[PDB]
Design a protein around this ligand. Sequence first.
Ligand SMILES: Nc1ncnc2c1ncn2[C@@H]1O[C@H](COP(=O)(O)OP(=O)(O)OP(=O)(O)O)[C@@H](O)[C@H]1O
Ligand SMILES: Nc1ncnc2c1ncn2[C@@H]1O[C@H](COP(=O)(O)OP(=O)(O)OP(=O)(O)O)[C@@H](O)[C@H]1O
Ligand SMILES: Nc1ncnc2c1ncn2[C@@H]1O[C@H](COP(=O)(O)OP(=O)(O)OP(=O)(O)O)[C@@H](O)[C@H]1O
Ligand SMILES: Nc1ncnc2c1ncn2[C@@H]1O[C@H](COP(=O)(O)OP(=O)(O)OP(=O)(O)O)[C@@H](O)[C@H]1O
Ligand SMILES: Nc1ncnc2c1ncn2[C@@H]1O[C@H](COP(=O)(O)OP(=O)(O)OP(=O)(O)O)[C@@H](O)[C@H]1O
Ligand code: NA
Ligand code: NA
Lengths: 68, 68, 68, 68, 68, 69
Amino acid sequence: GHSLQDPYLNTLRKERVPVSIYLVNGIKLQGQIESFDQFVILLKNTVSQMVYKHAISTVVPSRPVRLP
Amino acid sequence: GHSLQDPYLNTLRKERVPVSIYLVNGIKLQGQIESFDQFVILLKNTVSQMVYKHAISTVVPSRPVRLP
Amino acid sequence: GHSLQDPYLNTLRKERVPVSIYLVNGIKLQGQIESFDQFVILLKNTVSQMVYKHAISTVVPSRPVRLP
Amino acid sequence: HSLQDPYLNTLRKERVPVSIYLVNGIKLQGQIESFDQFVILLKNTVSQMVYKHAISTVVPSRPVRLPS
Amino acid sequence: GHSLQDPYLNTLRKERVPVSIYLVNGIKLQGQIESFDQFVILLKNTVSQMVYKHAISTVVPSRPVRLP
Amino acid sequence: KGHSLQDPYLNTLRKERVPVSIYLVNGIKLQGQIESFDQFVILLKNTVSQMVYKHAISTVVPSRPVRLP
Ligand SMILES: Nc1ncnc2c1ncn2[C@@H]1O[C@H](COP(=O)(O)OP(=O)(O)OP(=O)(O)O)[C@@H](O)[C@H]1O
Ligand SMILES: Nc1ncnc2c1ncn2[C@@H]1O[C@H](COP(=O)(O)OP(=O)(O)OP(=O)(O)O)[C@@H](O)[C@H]1O
Ligand SMILES: Nc1ncnc2c1ncn2[C@@H]1O[C@H](COP(=O)(O)OP(=O)(O)OP(=O)(O)O)[C@@H](O)[C@H]1O
Ligand SMILES: Nc1ncnc2c1ncn2[C@@H]1O[C@H](COP(=O)(O)OP(=O)(O)OP(=O)(O)O)[C@@H](O)[C@H]1O
Ligand SMILES: Nc1ncnc2c1ncn2[C@@H]1O[C@H](COP(=O)(O)OP(=O)(O)OP(=O)(O)O)[C@@H](O)[C@H]1O
Ligand code: NA
Ligand code: NA
């Protein structure tokens, strides 16, 4: 399920970790995860934007992180 | 669920906030959200059009949105 | 849910409005919506072709259209 | 699938020559030999299985009776 | 519903038929169907690699195959 | 057959810690070890553990063959 995606995203959110989100088309977004639900992530940095999960390849934290 | 996506689109809709919508294929659409449902967004501006969510990567508001 | 997509496509259909349908790969199709269901749209012209909704980015009517 | 199935079944049973445009822009030609919910067997020189998720459009070479 | 895909893939597996698998991105994989489930295919050659179906456009056997 | 192949296959690569290559839909090649996975994502370990959406993966390729249970 999301039995893993969620605590991971939530850990990045809670602790305000800088991340790169890579999109399926190769576009790289940077920021902190402000919030998220089942389908979108709200990314904040130089401009705030709502990102669709279905368009995301990877989420890469800038530092190692406690895992579920 | 859609606990985040929906109040976010509704606030954009209600406050007529100009948005940029970036499609998975890199095309940028521009305008205001007239309405939406689970699967599509109705975008009005110089050009009015129905946009399938599955083709959307990000929604970038022209100014930040305060959620309820 | 479908509260917008259905009445929007049904209106375009009943009114025989010429539409531009942009595919996810950038290609543009033009014609009239002959019919549609959950997964496909039948686009009328020289022949009526079947278009999977999953392959569509946007539907753009040639003229402004209301949905009373 | 109230439209897709009778439409593909007409194409199959009348052995109508078709074009299948894929989401990446590749164009396949042949005839529909069989299909189910997820795949179409496209028949020709070499026959092949096409995933509907990779199809953008299905374009018959001639007009065909339309499901009503 | 799966009355084509399963028996097609299973015939290709049982008979160890050389196949080409084309991905939506243009990549051409070659080998033989080792096993498959609802979502992935195990494609044997130098190692058995897991191919996600959603990434596949077509499956093309190296020779014709009689179905059950 | 549901996930009767994908789960044990990924589980094998996880438990045996076999290095894999994960190719993305856009051609990009990621490399590391499968730390864990759920229905939707795979955690890929190297410098940091990045999260890979399955919907963006075309293939997972083990650096060396392995066997299913
Ligand atoms: N974890 C990842 N997921 C998806 N794509 C990635 C990832 N890491 C790198 N890429 C992409 O792979 C390509 C090659 O990576 P490389 O490290 O050479 O790029 P880079 O110079 O670091 O650029 P960037 O800082 O934008 O990643 C780049 O287009 C990059 O954006
Ligand atoms: N927030 C975003 N989400 C997804 N894709 C984006 C985003 N911002 C830019 N891109 C993509 O990155 C590519 C690089 O273009 P760039 O961002 O430099 O132009 P731009 O700053 O958007 O210009 P303008 O603001 O005038 O549109 C664009 O093709 C665009 O599709
Ligand atoms: N409303 C839209 N939705 C999705 N894609 C679009 C839309 N409008 C244009 N495009 C695509 O984006 C690309 C660049 O857009 P641009 O602003 O140049 O439109 P255009 O090329 O003048 O339109 P046309 O191709 O009809 O002349 C075009 O190839 C077109 O296919
Ligand atoms: N029904 C369709 N579905 C998807 N793409 C199409 C369709 N018809 C044409 N195209 C694409 O539109 C582009 C422009 O088509 P144009 O009418 O200029 O040439 P064409 O005669 O359609 O070429 P062809 O049919 O050989 O692809 C081509 O790249 C073609 O692949
Ligand atoms: N299993 C695979 N899944 C998806 N893409 C692949 C795969 N193998 C190769 N590619 C594509 O090939 C390009 C580089 O080729 P690569 O070195 O990965 O071939 P290879 O698989 O090592 O060949 P061989 O199977 O002969 O060892 C990458 O951009 C990648 O997109
Ligand atoms: Na990149
Ligand atoms: Na094309």
